[PDB]
Symmetry: C6
């Protein structure tokens, strides 16, 4: 039984934060893709193009969709572009089941990088042959999600319409001028755009997601018999630390690990009830976390 | 029993719109090719060269011909040019049946791109060896359709005769000056030219074809128990939207999907009789489609 | 029983027109080659170098010789130069029979193109190793015919002797200065030169050959129950049309096909005795061919 | 039973000298990695980035960790970058056991060398695909330690904070400006930095380690029945000799071998109790080592 | 039983003309090589370096030696330089018999071409590894003959000693300055030099050799029942014709074939006793050869 | 039973002349390497770096060591740098015995050539991976001897210390500045240096070695029943001849062969007691060698 786009967007809220619009677009595009396959067509390729800054959650979204639909997923990088190698990999994680491999999803990262603005354009066209569809499996059935930051894109759109509000006005012609070929863009009808993650959102990233850092460590400490408590001040501190380094959400783990290093070192050598991480432990880094016996 | 060129052109009208002349040329060229094969020659290679703007329907035509004659078809891109790889692929979709693979059709896209005006010319000659004919299958039997936009071609013809009226005056020498070698052009006797698709034709593209967008979605909505109605105003609106973006017919799906996004999102969560898409839903994009219970 | 050079030249007159001298040279060279093989040598390599403008009939001659002697034939292009690949191909069309593959003929096209005037010279020498002879088959036994237009050749010969009369004065040293290495030319003792095909010869090309265009179409129409009649005016018209385009004999089919397009389209939908193609049908292209019921 | 980070750092003191902080960081990072694997996650990649001058003991540390945890180890050089070849090698030393190969450790040397400040960045991204995880083994499970000297790094950090004290202030953004891509650095949360080895430490290097030079030779002489005695003066002499040549600890063996050459030459031809190496034997090199019968 | 150098030089006189000195050098070098092998060494590599103008008979000599000693022979071109490929080829013509393949001879042509005066020097060294000796066969046993024209060599020798008299003064240092590496020249102890073939020698080339042109054709005509007679005037005429074209002995066949073309054409269509070729038939080319019934 | 360094140096005196110091260094380094292996370590890699002019006897030494210890030996050229190919070759001459192949010796020639002063440095590092140790055989066990002339080395050492006396002052830092990477030099602790062979030594080279030229020929003549006598004058003459050509010891065979050519030619055709080579036979080359019946 296929999950309504509602159920899809709902489950996406459990792994990714914000980007509600993009999650609606993806939810619909996805539902329609598998709704179209399960009825043997008779229809739209329904291929998707994700346009959002780095560390916005594009890859996470693609993966999440795959899991939510218990469907064979595989990544690939447009820079390393062998095109059929992606397919054999999809079969590898699919137990070599042709049909289940056709229901699969394929995420291509850094698409904006192959925009000729020779070999690059050649890749667009070579990969394009897949998008259409031709191991004996056909690539017509599999859904394609093409991520990318598209740096210069924010500019071309502005030179026409006259960041989020600007990416909403995105048009296929903007992608053309950017460096993508028409025949390639025409294969990516569904364009979902993500916003740059907010700073408070950072805190939500450390908390809300079912795989948030705090939850992982609270679990690591949990199998130690110890309860880890992150005070909101500490979480805000981590957010700021991450912003000052411009590392976005990618530089969150590098902060938490460094903050809980000493504590995780001599933790198994202790007997106490819980450890409490205050802001003083993060920002200053000089103060040791509160210990409770 | 071979279908008369009439039957062929007739069935081509069911997938492609306009290009009636090109469909006559293709119909004849095709009929003669398979009429020549089924009589074991004793004759003309009867190979075809499609010359039309991008998104004119060249690829669609080639595919359509293949299906109409239940004959093994395969594409290939002149830019990615391994030459025999195309053949093995033709055998892949042919169940490795030598004879049926010889009856096959092969479409080569972006031929105008390999026109030297070194490696490019080398490809013309390498691919030329196939056109003639030499797995054990011979490539003499298979029909070759070479598509291409031929941008500069419109110019050279003008510098001689002194867009459609100009492409009709096309001559093998024009292709020579364009960048094609004589021995290669002499293998493509049949030259069918397509016109740039008209704007009203756009509307016909959304309606007439048996795989038109409207029909696909009406079907997607149909298995939902809902009847989708496209008012002509909405279709004209879509046409205009596509023209303003210069994306031609390639930018039609990107419009329809965006227009039916919200509706397809919360459709499975509703119970009503039919949805009616008005022009207000397309152009303005602000108005939601009419809902009927 | 080996055919006397007379019988050979006689049968060559049935496929190729003119080039009588070249056909004498080839006839002798060929007879001597197979007369030398059938007696296990004890002798001259008797390898041949064809020098004639494009579309003169070099390839046709080579093929014709092969068929006339029921001997395994295969082509190859000096531009695509893997050298032993030609051999395996010769075995492919020979049922992998070593001896019959040694009796084979090998035509190398565009030899004049590999004349260094690095890699090119390297090909001359690599291919030279074959010419001498070394799968287990030896390439000493097989006859080598190396075609080529040799554009600049007409000039060097003139700078020495001081087009046909000039190509008759051809000397190994002329080929040296052209761009061929001595050790390579010394392997091609037999040099047959062809003349540029005459305009009236064009008409003869449309008629005389046993595979002439007129005969093929008269046959295509023949299995339709219809008799096709080409009036000499129409044939002369076709000749002129071909000359104005400088496409030589390569641009003949492209004319005839275009002329019989409409007629072949609605032919199977008619019931009449014969169609007669007049000059008005070719030159003007406006007049439809005479129809007789 | 997993060894507490204490036990880990303790055993690391038996092979590597100094770098106590780095050994704490590595100990924790390691303990957490295998503590996370043995509980089937539910967590942090816990990948490590070693930043220390050449001959600081980075490679030694990685190897030591591997042995201490009886886990399949393999090296690889970022300059020679085939990416999956490292994996097959890890399987080679793992008896092709998928699970045990997933518990493995992989050290990548000269990471600072691939910092683009095209192909280099491509390697970062290609290797990045491994770090994440995709033979059928998944590379997500295996721990990655990326060594490197990072010459210019000492500078960029200084241009921000305004050698050890400077490397302690290291930040992900410093690595960014250095030449590493964000998505790559975000995969290396754990950053352990080593100091340039001290000169007295040199003496400790010749003595303390369980594989110290003195111990090896004392053993080589030991199976000769002879006791080798290194006087502290000789060890200090060796230290100085090594410093004057700037060869660091890499130029220690080249000194000891040269010092014990003559003695090891005519040793098996003697009968005595022990040989004693004085400073006079090292610095001067003129004096022969004390011999005792 | 090994043939004395006398017997060797004697048999060499039956295929090659002149170059008596070179034939003495080769005879000795060869006798010593196989005299050294048949006694399992205990000695000199006894490798040979042929230095003579093109078409002097270097390749012919090497081949002749091989046949005379019923030993597996194979050629190779220094320009096409895969090094072990030569070996597998030697095994191909040796029935894959290791020992008999070790007794083999290997001729390398155009050695003077690989003289660096990067890749070239690399080939010298790569091929050098063979010369020394390392399929399981060892290349130490096989004799190496390295031919070459060495154009500039005639000059360097002159700049030192201060063409035949000059090539006799050849020294290893001359080859060094020419472009050969010392370690390579030291592997070619035996240096045999050939003179530029004389013009009267040309006539001897057409007569004396057991494979002379006259003998081949007299045989071709012989199996026709006809006796071919070459008058000395005709042979001298052929010699002159060849000299005027500077094609040396390589341009002899190209003359004889052209002279006997017409006659060999209508020969099988005649009944007569013998044909006699006079000078008038060659030089003038206008007069037909004398026919006798 | 392992041979004491004395026995080793003693046997080395039977093949190589002079270089006594280098033979002591090699003897020790070797003894220690196999003394360390036969005791399963517990120790020093004990890898060797030969530094001597071309034709000094580096390769000869390496080979000699291998034979003396009945251990699998194989060469390799740093210029041709596939790295594991050397290993498979070592297994080829080792009957594919893993253990015996680990006891093997590997000589790398022209190491000084790969000194970057990109690909070159890459080879140093790739080959470095072997030196350390990782077919299933480990390369840690096998001994590595890296030869090389190191031309510029004589200079850098001079610019520091302020040819033999200079090469004795060699230091790892000198090799660094030369073009070798630290991590590579640290793997070659044992540095043995050879002197340029003396002119009188040349005579000793023709006499002393158990494979000296004189002994080989005296043996070649010996199986002829003839005694060959080299008068010291002739040997000195050969020495001078070799020096005038600067070919060193590499140009000795090229002299002796040329001197005994005629004599070896008509030797098997004679019956006499002995031939005596005087100086007149060598220098003048005009006088024939004394013959005694």
């Amino acid at each position: 039984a296929l999950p309504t786009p509602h159920e899809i967007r709902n489950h996406l809220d459990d792994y990714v934060i914000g980007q509600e619009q993009a999650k609606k677009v993806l939810a619909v595009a996805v539902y329609n893709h598998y709704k179209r396959l399960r009825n043997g067509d008779t229809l739209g390729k329904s291929n998707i193009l994700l346009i959002g800054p780095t560390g916005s959650g594009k890859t996470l979204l693609a993966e999440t969709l795959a899991r939510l639909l218990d469907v064979p997923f595989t990544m690939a990088d447009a820079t390393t572009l062998d095109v059929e190698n992606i397919i054999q990999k999809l079969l590898q994680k699919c137990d070599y089941d042709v049909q289940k491999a056709q229901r699969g999803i394929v995420y291509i990262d850094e698409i904006d990088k192959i925009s000729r603005k020779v070999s690059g354009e050649g890749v667009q066209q070579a990969l394009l042959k897949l998008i259409e569809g031709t191991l004996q499996v056909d690539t017509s059935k599999i859904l394609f999600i093409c991520g990318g930051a598209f740096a210069g894109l924010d500019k071309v759109i502005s030179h026409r319409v006259e960041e989020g509000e600007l990416l909403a006005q995105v048009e296929p012609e903007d992608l053309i001028k950017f460096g993508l070929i028409p025949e390639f863009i025409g294969r990516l009808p569904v364009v979902a755009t993500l916003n740059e993650l907010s700073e408070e959102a950072l805190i939500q990233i450390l908390k809300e997601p079912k795989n948030a850092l705090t939850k992982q460590y609270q679990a690591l400490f949990n199998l130690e018999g110890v309860d880890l408590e992150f005070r909101d001040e500490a979480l805000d501190a981590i957010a700021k630390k991450a912003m000052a380094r411009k590392t976005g959400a990618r530089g969150l783990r590098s902060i938490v690990e460094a903050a809980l290093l000493d504590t995780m070192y001599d933790l198994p050598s202790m007997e106490d009830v819980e450890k409490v991480v205050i802001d003083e432990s993060v920002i200053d880094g000089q103060s040791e976390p509160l210990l409770i016996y």
